[PDB]
Symmetry: C9
Subunit: 103 residues, 9 copies
């Protein structure tokens, strides 16, 4: 279970099937076949690992959007859009909508 | 120096402030050496609380941006489109929106 | 001195200086425990702080309504902005969108 | 209940709690508590009154859109957008949309 | 010659001169007492005011329809405007877009 | 000479000239008393007048189809505009959008 | 009658004139002002179906146009990107989930 | 050489040359009758025409996939283009949209 | 080999937008290369779609790196950084908010 996690991290970081698979610690001579089955047997974990890796970088972008909202030297529209986004994360959304349908 | 939940709160703050996972790990109070493993498990076992803390911090910093949008809505020397978008945003925050749209259903 | 008003001042201080510690030390407590004691007030009263910020935005809303009306009636700005302002004010008046037909299959 | 509506219009025009409060006829010293409680207890009607005040300019917006739609010296895109808006108000909408489920 | 004509004239005056007090003075009453009864009379006929505004914009819609057709057929404007006008008029004709599929979960 | 074709001419004149009084005087009746009975006449024949206006608006669709096809076939047109025209005609041809899945909570 | 209706619809689509289309419908030129309104309104559904088929028959041309604009290296990258997006949307790769949460 | 082979070749020729009479003569039929037989021939086999055009659109999908991937991997492009390419390729990759809360009123 | 060459054929169609060269290089019956391919496409359209989907999806980490780095580059236009941050937060799980509905039957 540790080799598959390391393979997922290496594939997520260096975008290569054969290079990451040979970097896992396995046989070099057959690096085109066994790798498709190994990827086919752990698709759920690969998706989960890539999703959590993408999600773990959120604080840096949150800091970036907050800083652009408070930096006076950037265009005002960008600050307005950043403030709108962060306030929308705070929890204030849109309002009423009515539907008519009886046939 | 102890109470690992306080160290976890410091870890969350360090991850929120610095653009390096290794620096955050060294700032938590753990062993710096061999920084290739033993870090993924610590990062993965408390992801839910990390997300909750990030959400609470963003919501607590939202009022500063609300003040910013209000002040830009109150700036007379700024472009009209920016003022219009700010006014739309704050009025939508007050709770007054758009109206109906009709749907017809067929067998 | 009455309670719930000090919470209103605390909410305003947090809204103004984008920092929890400065608002907490300025409200009514001591320095020795300024990282924890503030967490119970913030986590147990999140609903009231959100309500206070929303009510302040709503109380400043009439100024923005006046602003959008004046921009809609000021000819010194680009025509698109006036058109968008007129559309928004008419949508606020109570005139919405039109028909949409749906057919469902299996 | 005319005084509350007058208070709402005065607050809408002079954008200040203290100035509107003193224009109501009240005490200068109590500008942080009692006015917040009265506003919190009559927010629904205050909001309705400000909405009707903004809505009373709807004929002005109709005049603005009609006059802007008929100017030949203005850029074509705005004339098109005005025509689209007025036609959407006229009562002509979009067309059919189908739903397919394949669970 | 009835208060229905005074109400229609009042609505038209508000539409053509964007002011409540002057419109009320144009209704036929004393100008000085324009702050008290006009708000109640204005609020008691909000539905009719909205209906009149809607009917007026719908009756002036054909001029805008002619304008949008002419801009769709006017060669001196940039192509994007002609395309958007043609798309709008064709969508009005009754030829629209197609399906979107839905997946439901438990 | 019957109310159906006279009403059709009334609708066509209203569609062409953008004037209520001109259309009514073209109908064939007395010009002066055009302010009172006209509200009842419009209220009693609004549905067919609106249907006629919609039919006239929809009948110009072949012109818009020709315009969108020619703009899609002009190499001197902006690439985005040609792409949008091709998208519009293909979406009318019968190729639409795709899946949308929902996750539900009790 | 269905072929005269087809020619009438095509003439209306191409020669932008109601009088020309009606006279092309094979009828008398002089009395071309009255019968034409009933004739046009009595077959609106078939006219719409034929015109829809006419607009759809040029769809392969739009396919060729979008492919050619997507394959031109001298075009801005955004236009090629949007053309690829559109062609993929027909290819069978679409958007993803949207969740609804209710509070009641 | 089969009649379905002549018809699919006709569909491909219509897709390539964009002329009905030329496409009809390219189908394998008589040139002198290019106005009559062509309307019924196109109307009676619309389903297969739609299937053929859909297959032609689907067979070029790898080129568009390569284009979007290279645009996401092209360093000389403006930031908006790279961002849109990356977002689109991830949308196909399988990471969904945001969350939405719904409020209902009786 | 019945099925690994078929996977190679799927990849060849995904990469080089052609049919005759890929079909002759796969190892199949050349004399009937216009028909046999229609039968294989009709019998394996779902598998072809799955393979092309995997081909497009497997490059996702490169684009994720691109969007993350654009969010962290100070020399890029502000709108681009804002949109990148919006996308990364949308993946984190914070989107737009509530909508209220009123029904009249």
């Amino acid at each position: 279970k540790e080799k598959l996690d390391l393979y997922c991290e290496a594939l997520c970081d260096g975008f290569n099937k054969t290079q990451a698979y040979i970097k896992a610690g396995f046989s070099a001579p057959h690096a085109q076949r066994n790798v498709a089955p190994y990827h086919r047997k752990n698709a759920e974990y690969i998706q989960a690992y890539i999703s959590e890796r993408i999600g773990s970088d959120a604080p840096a972008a949150r800091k970036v959007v907050l800083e652009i909202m408070n930096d006076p030297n950037e265009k005002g529209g960008i600050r307005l859009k950043a403030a709108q986004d962060i306030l929308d994360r705070a929890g204030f959304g849109a309002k009423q909508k009515i539907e008519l349908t009886t046939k």
